């Protein structure tokens, strides 16, 4: 039961166009 | 039914300014090219609309909380910052300046100043002064600082351009002013026209 042999995480992250300030 | 009373008739509203027309490239090729709208904003300063026929029936006013709103005409893939403030001095005039960034840097300088995209909307407040004054309403006469309580000054700090870096040149429009307003007027009269 070796853990953690291979682990990957995803995480998103949204594009939007025309952030406001 | 004749009382020959005084009173301050606070009443709220909402109006409709101007369309605002972004400069471009062509038009735009010195410092005062980049002041889109020079508004005064007195009740009496707008024929059309509702706040000025009303105006038009007192001798005075004094807005107790007024604001100036954007409202875009057009999608988020142009891009240009605007800059809006009121000076509550109806002379003081950035007209005569030549450098762009002293006429934002003043303008940015003012309290009640707004920076924005004209692609989102915001609201320019009015800072109301604090000695109770009163101010005029019918057309500006000699001096201005007894009719206005204030000036809006919207300013063009970026160039126009477009999905592409194309460059737009033909002055086009961009949004509308809208200005939602508080006033109390006190005299009962008509003014002349
Ligand atoms: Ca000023
Ligand atoms: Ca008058």
Do not use: C, H, M, Y
């Given at each position: 039961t070796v853990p953690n042999f291979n682990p990957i995480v995803a995480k998103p992250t949204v594009a939007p166009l025309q952030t406001n300030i | 039914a004749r009382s020959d009373v005084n009173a301050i008739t606070v009443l709220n509203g909402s109006d409709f300014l101007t369309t605002v027309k972004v400069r471009?490239?062509?038009?735009?090729?010195?410092?005062?090219?980049?002041?889109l709208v020079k508004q005064?904003?007195?009740?009496?300063?707008?024929?059309?609309?509702r706040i000025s026929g009303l105006s038009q029936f007192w001798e005075r006013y004094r807005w107790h909380k007024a604001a100036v709103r954007y409202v875009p005409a057009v999608p988020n893939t142009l891009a240009c910052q605007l800059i809006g403030y009121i000076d509550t001095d109806p002379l003081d005039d950035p007209n005569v300046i030549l450098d762009v960034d002293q006429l934002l840097r003043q303008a940015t300088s003012q309290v009640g100043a707004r920076q924005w995209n004209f692609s989102d909307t915001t609201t320019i407040p009015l800072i109301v002064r604090r000695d109770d004054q009163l101010y005029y309403?019918?057309?500006?006469?000699?001096?201005?600082r007894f009719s206005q309580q204030g000036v809006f000054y919207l300013l063009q700090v970026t160039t126009l351009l477009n999905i592409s870096g194309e460059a737009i040149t033909n002055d086009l429009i961009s949004g509308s002013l809208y200005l939602d307003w508080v006033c109390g007027f006190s005299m009962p009269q008509i003014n002349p026209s």
């Open positions: - | 471009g490239s062509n038009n735009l090729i010195d410092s005062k090219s980049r002041i005064p904003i007195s009740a009496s300063s707008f024929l059309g609309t309403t019918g057309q500006d006469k000699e001096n201005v």
